[PDB]
Every structure is written in C-alpha cells, then in structure tokens.
Design a binder for this molecule. Structure first.
Ligand SMILES: O=P(O)(O)OC[C@@H](O)[C@@H](O)[C@H](O)[C@@H](O)CO
Ligand SMILES: O=P(O)(O)OC[C@@H](O)[C@@H](O)[C@H](O)[C@@H](O)CO
Lengths: 557, 557
C-alpha cells in the first residue's frame, strides 16, 4: 500500500468512520453540547486584528479531532514542518529547499541553505524593490518622453501572475497614489491586445515576471509588448526605461535585452505558486506601496510563527488540513469550495485553485510507490452572496457532499448607507452556514405550504421538494478587516494547510512534474499548424481537429 | 427507488460498465481503429460557421453509445423535449411552461401557453429593446442635464446578472460605438461603491434587472443607486431618464418609481438562468447593438432546431448529455470542467456553473421519490492556457477522474503578430487533450530520463513521478469563430444538454427551491446584528460568530 493507508492511526480513523459516521448529525452535536462553538473554534489575536476559525459546523466529535491530531503526529507533521523552516531540501524530487517562509521572515533569524544564511539576499532584493517603488510612485522614474509612469503591466503566467493579481484586487483600497496595474497572462492574443489598446507607450512600464525567463507564453507576450513599445519609441535604448524583470535566470534576462540593474532576483527555493512574497510581488508593492507590502509579509510571518509554535490540537492550518483529510479520505469528497463574502476577494478561490491543486494533485509518494488513496481536492468557488443565487442550489439540495469555507471581514472597506449593505452581507454569511447545517424539516415546510393556501393534493406533491436534509458541514473564517496584514495571514494559513495535507499523504507538495507532457506535445504541434499540408502524425482525433482548423481558418463570416 | 435506477436499460449500461469499463483504453482504441474520429464526432454546418463536437477521446465504444441512446429513448427524452417546445407546463413544482426557446423563436411559429400564442409579446418586447438601443447608442437619449449616455449599469444578481455579463465579455470586440457596460450584483457595498466612484449621474443609465423585483440584493443596490442619483439630480422626474427595469412585476416596478414606458417585460416561463435571451439581455443589446443581439438569438434558434429535429445518435446536446450520464452515474465523477481557450470567454465556465448546477442540483423526482443515484455535477473551470499553469497538474497526475470540455474558435478576434499567439494557443488546446488521452508509460519516461543523462540511482528515484497514466477523457468543441451567432448556438447547446440530463434523472431542471430558501434566510439574523447585546437565539456557532462580529466591528486598523 502507501504510507498513509499503512498507518495505524489512519486505519483507526477509517474504521471509526465506517462504524460511527452515520451517528454524526450536526443538529444533534450542537444540541448535546452548548460549549461546542467554544471547543471547536480558534480566536486568534494577531495584535493587528483577530482571525476566528470556526470549525464547529463540521461532522466531528472530540474523539474524531483527537484521532485526526494523532494521525498528523504519526505522519511526521511536526518534524516535516521544522525541516521546511530550517531550509532542509524537502522538495525531494528536485532536491530543493522550500523557503517561502524566508521571504517574509521579519525577525531576520538566520535560515541557512547549504550552510549560508539566505536572509541578507532576501533583504537586499526587498531594499531594491523599495527603492524602485519610490522612484516609480513619486514620478521620478520617467518614460522615454520624460513623463511619469501611470500604468504598470505585469506579464507572466501561473505563479508569476495569479498571486500579484489576486492580492492587488484584494487590496485595491490601499492603492491611492499608486499607478494602475494590469495583468497579462494568457497567450491568447486577446489578452495583450486589449491591454495595450488602453495604454500609452510613454507612460506604461512592463514587469516581465518569470522564474525561468523561458516560459513560452510570457516571453511571447513580452516580445509583443516590446514590439508595440518600439513602434512608438523607435529607440532600442529606451526599452530600459519601460521594461524590468523578475527572475532567477540572469542570463536569459540579458538575452531578452533588459538592464541588469532592472532585474529583481528570487531563488529556486521559491516555488512559483508560493512566490508573491518575493520579487514577484513587485506589482503589489508598486500598486499599494512598499509599507503595505511589508504589512502583507508581516501577516504571513505571524501565521508562520503560529504554525511553528502552536500545539497541533489548536494550530489553525493543521486543523483545517485535518478536517480536509477527514472529508477527502474518509467521506470521499472530491471538492472543496472557497466562498469569500467579499468582492475584493473575487480571485481568492482561483488563487488557491493553483496553490492547492498544483501542490497536491499528485499520485506518487516519497518512496516512489503509487498512492492507494485520494490526494488533493478540486478547489472552486465564487464570492457570496452571488453563489446563493447560482450554485448553492446544488450545495443545499444536490447529491454531493461539499466541504465549504465561508470567509468574511467584520469591517467593510465601504460602509455605505450607514453600514446597511454590510449588515445584509453579514446576515447572509451567517444564515447560509446555519441553513446548510439545519436544513428544513418536513413539519416546518408543511406549515409553510399550508399557510400559502396550497390544496391538500398540491401540498402533498410539493412537500419533499421544500425539505432540506441539512447536515452540510462548513468552516466559517471571520476576520476583523481585510487589511494587507490580515490578507497575508490568511494566505499563509492556507499555504500551511496545503503543506500539512501533503505531508500526511506522503506526496511532494512542491514539484509539478505533471506539466511536462502537455508542453512536449504542444512543441510538436506548433510547427505543424503552419501551411496547407495535411497532418497525419497523431491519433485520428488530434489529426481531425487540425484538419478542421486548416479548413476553417480562411472562411469569411 | 427512482426512475433512472429502476430502468432496465440503465441497469444494463451499469452492468456493462462493471464488467467491461476497465478494458477501455484510449491509446489502444485509437491505434486499433483509424476511423475513430470520424465515428465519434459531429461536424455541424450552421451556414454561419461550423461547430465540430469531437467526442472521440471519450471512454466509449459503439456499443456504449448504442446503450446510452437506447437509455435516452427509454427515458422519453424526445417526448419531453417536444413538450418543452410546445409550451406544456413541464416545470411541475411551479406549474409553469419552460420557454426560453420561444424568446429566440425566429421562425415565429406560434407557441401557446394557456391557449395563447406567446410570440406577439416576445416580439413586442424585442421591438421595444431595438428602439431603445437605437435611441441610447445614437446619442439621442439625453440625461437630466442634456448629455448623451456614456455608461450603462446593470443591477441584478444570479440569472439577472451572469448571462449579460458573460455575453458582453465574450462579445467585447462587437461593442465599438456602444456605451461602457458595468455589472453590479453583490450586496457587498464594495460592488456598487467602486462602480459609482467611476461614474457621473449625468451620463449613467441604470438597468434594474429582476424577474420578481423583490430580491434583496438587487432592490437594495437599486435604492442605493437611486439615492446617489437623486443627491445630484434633486428631481424625481429625472429618474425616468436614468432608470429602466427588466421584470415580470409591473406593480413593484411602479412602486420603486420607474415609468411603465421604461419597463421591458418578460414572463414566468423564462427561468432566470435561461433569461439572457429575454429583456434581461438589454445590456447585451445596448453594448453590442441590437443587430448583434438578434444574431445571438438566431444562433440559439439554429441549435434549438438541431436539438428538435436531429436523430438522437447524431444530436449534439443529447450526446454531450449521455456522455455526462456515463461519467456521473457509471464512473461516479463528481465534476465537469469547462475549459475555453479564449480570454473573451473567461466567464463562460462560471455561467454554466450556474446554469448546470442550479438546474440539476436536485434530489427529488417527478414521482416524489428521493434519488438513489447522483444528479448534477459540480461545474468549474478557467480559460486556457492559464489553467495549464494553475490546476492541470491535478487533472494529469491527481487521483480524480474529471471529464473536460475543451473549447476554442479557429479564428481569433485579434490575429496579432501574423497569427503567432493564436498558433500557440491552438497548439496547446490540441496538445492538452492529446496528453490527457495518451499519457506516458514508465518505459517511455525511462527512455527520456536515460537520454537526459540521469544516473541509474537518479533515474529510478525520478521515474514514477514522470509517469502519466493518461486515459483521461475529453470533448473538443471547435468552432469557426466566436461570433454572436456561434456563441448563441454554443450556449443553447449546453442548455439542452442540461435539459436532457434532467429528464433522464427524472428531476425538474427548472425550479430552484434551494435558491428560494436562500431568499428566506437572512431576514431573521439582520435585526440581531444591531446593538451591543449578546445573541443566544441560535446554535452556539451562529451565536459565537455574531458575538465576534459585535466585538470586532469597532476596532481601529
Ligand atoms: O515563472 P515562470 O518560470 O515563467 O513559470 C510560470 C509558471 O509556469 C509557473 O509559475 C508554474 O505555475 C508553477 O511552476 C508555479 O509553482
Ligand atoms: O431576477 P430576480 O427575481 O431578482 O432573481 C435573481 C436571482 O435570485 C435569480 O435569477 C436566481 O439566480 C434563479 O432563480 C435564476 O434561475
């Protein structure tokens, strides 16, 4: 088998689930114990706001949580965590350290890789970012015609795109005095074309974000941007005023033709999907200011320390991870929904789609043996309250069990109409998890149908449609306000949740070998699309699709 | 038990799956039969472009498809379809017709509800929309200070938001000469506040989109917009130049203060999640022009006729539905991914997340029986190529089976760099489904590692991580260009897929009693948030979360 399934604490948990999980009813759990909320929630005081992690509306008892914590211990979570933090090469397939925690290590306590403290270099790049932010935001950095920069365009994909995008969206209220920020990522020419259409070459600065500086989408987009720029500037030396690079590849940055002083470095132990805390966050710092960027780092650092110092039984990312294991490996739930009741957080779910799914969508363990159990879930979601009108129908009355995290700030960035909108938002946030837990009983629905003037025949037929089984588990994560600090803490919390799950599954959360095949096959097809010749080199579907492309591309509509 | 599980053709299908499905291997299926693509694809000529539905990379044989079509016939799909199209009240829990097909019935063949043809009123409202669009887009319609309208703002949620949003995004290239369009939907005050911050009351036209005209988010947002407007205009008569309504509720529209001449009517047989074809599409028509809106309707009409007149074995929405049943009810796949390789289509997946999940996230059948089988899947996705860098790791190398629909236009709206970007986009579109199908055997990966110069130790360590199991099924849907017509056909195709699945499961695809419950929920909690006193009226979690809100809302950060 695999490490997890051979573990006796896991076997005990699974056997308990088989024998007892039918006895678990949320309504009954709360009725039996008025201390349930108190015993199944964590109220974290960060000194810069509180984060309440309420996991009480979950299908767990004291005994279940105990079994889960014991499993985390016997799967080596505590030791694995310490190994990450100390710079051990825990990304074992690539023989790399995993040190996004170093990027936000505000204490500056030494963290060594290959015997060398990484903190001086982390801080050197941060200082460079701060200086660049001053130059650009002040208007001192001039474009090729001597004008101040008004627009910043990040060009990158995946880990070099989603973090900065999600964070600048979430922290929009903190962007006064900052340039407008744009994100180009898709190779689809629509993306760069529609972006450039709204910009002036005189006042636009491009940030080319790429760990490797070889990613086809990013370099192609970058070259398109440069061509557009040079059409107006007509001077190759002006490129240095309008293009900067975030990379680990000094040589490839030079080949593109960017000034070496224009390069903001990061390191191989910064995974792309854990990179917003590094030089990759330059567009964040430019947009909201370096002070706010430091606050974002500080929030993450707080959560890192919480994760490092806290006994597992009251350790927020550990508990979230354990609940996920319970639902994935015992209940067999394929998915996990992230439902922020916050428009600014509209890209939060998409961010953790990558963070979670690219990390833990794995099937080979440390020993090289194939898993014989589920690993990472499919992560999805949209902001509330919109979901209530759109897919919550299925959450309430479908045939799937879907663990949901509901998230909301207590304080809104826009307290319009004396707080009326936020009052309603909060009320919906609370009511939805309550409804998911409680459902609606036949006796309740029957009285409603009776009062609505339904005939005995109509009542009889309608009744089962109006009944809600409930017993649908949720987490509620509530925080004082969505400030840069609190957002940093929240992102770090989910990073560590993902880490804990990966350790428990015995997989590598930090590689991504699954990207290779698609890239190889795309390289083969690209040159085949050019010209009129029939393509026969693939399976009949691929060939047939190419034939359709060649036949349809000249047709005038 | 339920209709589907009691059905002998379904039990035959399921038994066949049990005995034979493990022997279905895509790589080998294609090798054995050069005609596979030809036998498992539909090349539809609409006379306004082609739509190729290539379903050959699915885990199916001729026999499987035969059994599925037989099941569809046994479940009375054709009769149910005819009943929808004829105006029968197939929404049985609400006693309503289901007539989104009437909205786009370009043929004008009578469709009767309660003995009366609905087409005259459909066309009267369309004519009203056409006239209004001409007046606004020409600049003739003037605001309260005598200026032309520059911005239109749709206020609505769910079915009154997502359709027009997705379509205006998808058809952005067709919006030259139209006013800017904004969508406000969330009750979260951020949504309206940030929208209004960018607008002038003098040049903004608000569209209040609401079937009932009682939805809390929409009416609150509308009242907020009206207050903001009147703060500037200071004249109630000015509202008639700046507010229109899309509704079925004349009385409530009047009560809000909107002119009856400013009301664009629709009907109870237009489900919200099927409503973009109605008056609800006014923001589409304003943005891209009425002619393009008519083309959108015409494309849907083409697909309606395809669905109505085509034998099941060659009927695109039917085949898509049947493949879904195969994966849902035989393989047990919880989810369905929609992956359009088109930035303009960035909200397409979200739209059908609503359309599918709200329709078929049900568990009571027409007979009143609780289903003892799965119904609607969780629908999710993001546009390619970004997904390849976000979550495709899990699709390729996770532990979940995930049916994916890959979609792309042959012709791009922006053929920049002499088509270079689109060439790369197409190459990735093709490569990804090829990769998911083919995988990479241990021996193939071994040879690659050997060629790369890996030592026996390093090779053995890396090998299992480099293996792709493949056999991951996809649909490829390729179309000449994403024009208004073709988009209309594509949306209608998925509408009918959803319909067919609903009939086969014996559920009502057209009610939403879970969504209806949601609108009953927050009212109780609302007044409890006011004041400093503790709330004890709920379960301890709801109580505890309310306590946290009250304790945290005054803290300065
Ligand atoms: O930053 P690069 O080298 O251009 O790579 C861009 C993306 O492919 C990359 O971020 C990818 O999402 C993952 O490896 C992140 O963990
Ligand atoms: O359009 P209304 O009445 O304001 O309702 C707004 C939404 O609740 C409504 O569209 C909901 O998404 C579903 O019923 C659509 O099928």
């Amino acid at each position: 088998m695999a490490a997890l399934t051979r573990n006796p604490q896991f076997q005990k948990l699974l056997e308990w689930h088989r024998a007892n999980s039918a006895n678990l009813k949320l309504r009954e759990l709360f009725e039996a114990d008025p201390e349930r909320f108190n015993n199944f929630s964590l109220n974290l005081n960060t000194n810069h706001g509180h984060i309440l992690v309420d996991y009480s509306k979950n299908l767990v008892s004291k005994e279940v949580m105990q079994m889960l914590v014991e499993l985390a211990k016997s799967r080596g979570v505590e030791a694995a965590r310490d190994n990450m933090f100390s710079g051990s090469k825990i990304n074992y397939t690539e023989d790399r350290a995993v040190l996004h925690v170093a990027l936000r290590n505000r204490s500056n306590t030494p963290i060594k890789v290959d015997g060398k403290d990484v903190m001086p270099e982390v801080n050197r790049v941060l200082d460079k970012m701060k200086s660049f932010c001053q130059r650009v935001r002040s208007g001192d950095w001039k474009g090729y015609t001597g004008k101040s920069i008004t627009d910043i365009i990040n060009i990158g994909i995946g880990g070099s795109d989603l973090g900065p995008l999600m964070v600048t969206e979430a922290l929009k209220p903190y962007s006064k005095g900052g340039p407008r920020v744009w994100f180009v990522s898709n190779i689809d020419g629509t993306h760069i074309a529609k972006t450039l259409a709204s910009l002036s070459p005189e006042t636009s600065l491009f940030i080319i974000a790429s760990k490797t500086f070889t990613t086809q989408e990013t370099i192609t987009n970058a070259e398109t941007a440069k061509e557009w720029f040079l059409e107006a500037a007509k001077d190759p030396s002006a490129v240095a005023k309008h293009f900067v690079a975030l990379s680990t590849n000094t040589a490839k940055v030079k080949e593109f033709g960017i000034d070496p002083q224009n390069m903001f470095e990061f390191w191989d132990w910064v995974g792309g999907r854990y990179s917003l805390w590094s030089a990759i966050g330059l567009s964040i710092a430019l947009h909201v200011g370096f002070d706010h960027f430091e606050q974002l780092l500080s929030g993450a650092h707080w959560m890192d320390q919480h994760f490092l110092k806290t006994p597992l039984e009251k350790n927020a990312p550990v508990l979230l991870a354990l609940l996920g294991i319970w639902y994935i490996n015992c209940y067999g739930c394929e998915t996990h929904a992230l439902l922020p009741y916050d428009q600014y957080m509209h890209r939060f779910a998409a961010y953790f789609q990558q963070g979670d799914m690219e990390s833990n969508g794995k099937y080979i363990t440390k020993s090289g043996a194939r898993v014989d159990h589920q690993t990472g879930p499919i992560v999805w979601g949209e902001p509330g309250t919109n979901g209530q009108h759109a897919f919550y129908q299925l959450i309430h009355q479908g045939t799937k069990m879907i663990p949901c995290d509901f998230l909301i700030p207590v304080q809104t960035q826009h307290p319009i109409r004396k707080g009326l909108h936020h009052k309603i938002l909060l009320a919906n946030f609370l009511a939805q998890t309550e409804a998911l837990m409680k459902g609606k009983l036949p006796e309740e629905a029957r009285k409603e149908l009776q009062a609505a003037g339904k005939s005995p025949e109509d009542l009889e037929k309608l009744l089962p449609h109006k009944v809600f089984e409930g017993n649908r588990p949720t987490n509620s994560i509530v925080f004082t306000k969505l400030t840069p600090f609190i957002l940093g803490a929240l992102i770090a919390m989910y990073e560590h949740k993902i880490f804990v799950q990966g350790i428990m599954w015995d997989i590598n959360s930090f590689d991504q070998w699954g990207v290779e095949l698609g890239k190889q096959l795309a390289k083969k097809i690209e040159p085949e699309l050019e010209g009129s010749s029939a393509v026969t080199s693939h399976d009949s579907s691929t060939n047939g699709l190419i034939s359709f492309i060649k036949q349809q591309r000249d047709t005038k509509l």
